[model samples]
Target chain A: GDPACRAAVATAQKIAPLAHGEVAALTMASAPLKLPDLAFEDADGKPKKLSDFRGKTLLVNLWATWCVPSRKEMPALDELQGKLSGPNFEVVAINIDTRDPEKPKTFLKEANLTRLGYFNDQKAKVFQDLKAIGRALGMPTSVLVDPQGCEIATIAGPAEWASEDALKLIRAATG
Target chain B: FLELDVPKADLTIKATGKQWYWSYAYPDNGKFEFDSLMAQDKQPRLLGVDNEMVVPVNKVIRVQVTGADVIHAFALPAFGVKIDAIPGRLNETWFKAAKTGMFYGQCSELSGKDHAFMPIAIRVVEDKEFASWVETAKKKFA
Candidate 1:
């Protein structure tokens, strides 16, 4: 058992109540699972892994341009990224579009979604990795991970990330 | 003697089996897509779909299948295609029809109570007819 994840459980508990209204479907980690370090490329195509963000709580989201609801929820996530992005907390939204790498970038540009940084997995192994752990069901999978790389919460679909309810929930995790 | 060869697919279709229907996306054709629901007043009963997956006959067509919520199978028996529409994983199958006609199948895997209701209908047509259908589908779904 990952005893270290007990701390994450506390964070999950604190944020559990905040998961209401816009983020009602958020599942808090009663038995926290340590997440695998996901690897993907940044906008420059440089190698970046999940473990790189140690000590900072992360909201990792897997998105694709082809998914209708995923594209629709981009703006709120962009706003959320800008609101709580700092040393203590970061929103890491990764694109899992396996084909035509340019289109995802172009979509963000056309939509004027500038707050969130670009990160993508050309092969989409990150989705499979999360899927293997029973965390990912389909596209637009988001996980709340504690500083120690333990899962604090998970949501299968899109949520209003820019809403006050989501902010409070994320804030509870960061501190 | 042993001989094995396969033709490259002319185009790809993304099929995601949902609760009680099939969702299809023609990514190559203007990135348009639509859902295939059970036709309430169709001749073939459970096999008929409101929006059939249209493809050109005699062309190697590849279908990438997956599930949106639950595990379902994208099966078209006439084409000898049956692949699991698993969530988070993409499975592929290909087939080429020699004749132009409507081919039908259902979710071979028992997923939910409505699994038996989800059906797969492929409408194979001539090259000219396929192009015209693509234009119409693009306008409606895209």
Candidate 2:
């Protein structure tokens, strides 16, 4: 059966006006679509899927160390996670850096992003999958999904995630 | 190495580079500055700028280069000039164009993602043409 997405539009409509300043391009999802069951890895290199983090509102962001904007955006993502992460909400910031896994880990450590959890996709297949669905482009793509695994909104670039405007939007959406 | 001390430089052009583009400032001539960006429709693919670093032919011109951010380089193969553009430090190089034509160079250092796209286009013209360009540039860049 398809994911129950009846409340996705209403949540998006409520937060649509709050998508100001850094998140102006954050667009609401008009139609309900299930993101491909993306496969990635955790800190131990154990394979993980999107379904593993089910029943939570997730801000799934794809980033890489080579991506210039992602470097500046990582700290903001970490801040958002620190401020809002709980049993009902989580920030799944995924690193798409190829080849060396330690590069991203060291970079995160160097930047003092202690709040963020390590998630990786060395093959960058997640980017390809999101691109195939017209959701991912360029670098640092972030997708906002509902607890039922339905699309709520998507932003293709970095945003002031920890700002009050964004926090307000996220708070209202979670409610 | 040829002696560059004989003919005193007519003027100095300061190239302040950053990120993926070169901004040329004619300090001696009206102190006007303009940014040189890549153009797609222009000829010679990846080496064309809408506004070029224009100078007079057969003139001993000294170029002072410095980077605003990371370490970048300035190079021109035909004129035999290549130097680093480091931040907070001024580096100097000189060039003389014997012919009147468009000459191209690029950021020699692997600075960042846009390094491959950063091109330096120089247009060598007569003294009279250069004076005319300066007159137009003074107000346009002002």
Candidate 3:
């Protein structure tokens, strides 16, 4: 039993990455929060529900195509998604674009974002539901949602989502 | 005629503001370092600086100010070391204490919301006590 446990632990450690003390804001076992029901149109103009991705560990990234940090961090998230290619894990990129859908499509295509599901919220309803007040704030916020669709942890700014620590959390929850 | 008999200060405290916080360096004591954080909550007014700056009373002290990102002004009403911290510039100032227990200083400009809460507290002790306190603080932070 000890050897099996040790092997299992080593495998998980190999797949997981740890974050710095400065970056860790919450402890493990904290369930991601269930955000209020928000609807948005996907690329095909089909309405998407916030609860549609239930029973899966979700990394709901709130971002915009214009934010530099968001753009810089996109590849990391994509890389993270590539590492976990199972149905239990999902990366839902919630794009906060208010302009024409063509702009977001052009931006995503130019950026070569293909690993995760793409979503566009033009009406800014998610911010209103999340109670993100004021106009001074910009995009690049990410929230971790558990299987039950609860918001567990929220990074208010940009972060390296493909970092080891982030992958550890995703693997531990999903894999 | 009004005459102000200001007492000499024993040591100087220099603080510089950054994009979100304040950094303090003690040049006199081999340059020990500590950064100050402003309370982001709105409930308390001037409830800042958990670690107070300690120095002796009635001694001459000099201060140097610099900035990390933007410009900020360091102002203390009682000790009178009002200096500006420009991004790539350093400003010099001096102050002496006439009376001391605990005095405070903060960024004078409307730089951000948490600006006013970051206070500078100075405790005037005997010279030996100040030396001992600095030694202990170095170990704590190191």
Candidate 4:
């Protein structure tokens, strides 16, 4: 088991070179980091879980409308979702705004985030869970999870998700 | 603990530090509020803001600082001004830019993850230009 684990880790390390620019901040997990199956609400108040996207390579971003870096990166994430969202990959952008729920809705509307779906965790339980597991340090935290729902890499700050370097990294991971 | 006092203030600007940006309100000029964000592509990188804090050159301007969400320090190194913006408390500082140019500063206190992105740009213009800017800003921010 140790040898197999080491080999698996080595394979994951090989993908590190693919990261460039802002995406270079992504640090690969030595082993699969199982994230909490936290529950959140969709735009229409429908309940959902992080596990719902288990079968796909997911880029889970936890952001708030108040965060400046998050505001800058949301449009890029939306554009990235427009291009890479499919059966094999998806961007799960979740808003953790503790203020009025309508605040994030209005922010997204003003931001013109057309492609990304609205997901909110008003209580920010998901952020708390991620923090508890050492996956999140602050707002605009993003996690790259493999098809098995295990975190493969994580970024503490925002990055240019629509950049060409970011697209290449996503393509390499999804492929 | 520097001892420097201004007998008079030409303008009084109330700046409130939010989560990751600076909101400036010219209380003396029309009480119009506007946010100052970092410029996307500029020479100063994260130091350039969209709306600069306009002040008249060679005049002492009083700045009132306060925090809306968390603790943030308003620091202008060029004019040797640094004050803590604490919630529920208002702090005052003053600056007199002798030259007519753009000066830069930032939120010195580490408030959050995007603390480095909160920049402050102060534009020192002539008295006439300052008045003209005030007229336009009142209409735009209002």
**DockQ for each of the predicted structures, in order?**
0.02, 0.02, 0.04, 0.04
lDDT of 2 at B85: 95
Per-residue lDDT tens digits for candidate 2, residues B4-74, read 45546887999988988899999898898999986657422222567889889889899999999987778
Residue B113 alpha-carbon offset, candidate 2, angstroms: 3.1
Q: Each candidate: what lDDT?
A: 0.78, 0.77, 0.58, 0.75
- Tens digits of per-residue lDDT for model 1, A1-175: 4998999998888777677655655678989589999999998989999999989999999888766446656887888889998999988989988889899999999989987779999888998899899887655678999889999998766666777778988888887
- Compare candidates 1 and 3 on lDDT and give the better one: 1
**Residue pairs in steric clash, candidate 2?**
none
Please report how far candidate 4 places residue B99 from its true position, in Å: 41
Give the CA lDDT, 0 to 100, for residue B25 in model 1: 91
Worst 10 residues of 1 chain B by lDDT: B106-115
Q: Report RMSD (Å) for each prediction in the order shown.
A: 17.0, 16.6, 15.7, 12.6
- Candidate 2 chain B: worst-modelled 10 consecutive residues by lDDT: B106-115
Off by over 4 Å in 3: A1-33, A132-138, B1-142
Q: Please, what are the lDDT tens digits per residue for candidate 3 over residues B1-142?
A: 0136553434555677786556777876767788766433533221335566666656677667788888876665445456778888878766655433444342221223432333444555667877788889788766
Fnat, model by model in order, equals 0.00, 0.00, 0.00, 0.01
Output the TM-score of candidate 4: 0.58
* Span of ten consecutive residues with least summed lDDT in model 3 chain B: B106-115
Clash count of each predicted structure: 0, 0, 16, 0
- For residues A1-175, what per-residue lDDT tens digits would candidate 3 score against the true structure? 2222233334333432332221232222222233676677687778998788887767777666555445556777777788875678788877766767677677677868788667878876775566542211234556656666655455444444665556766676566
TM-score of each: 0.57, 0.58, 0.50, 0.58
Instruction: Report the CAPRI category for model 1.
Output: incorrect
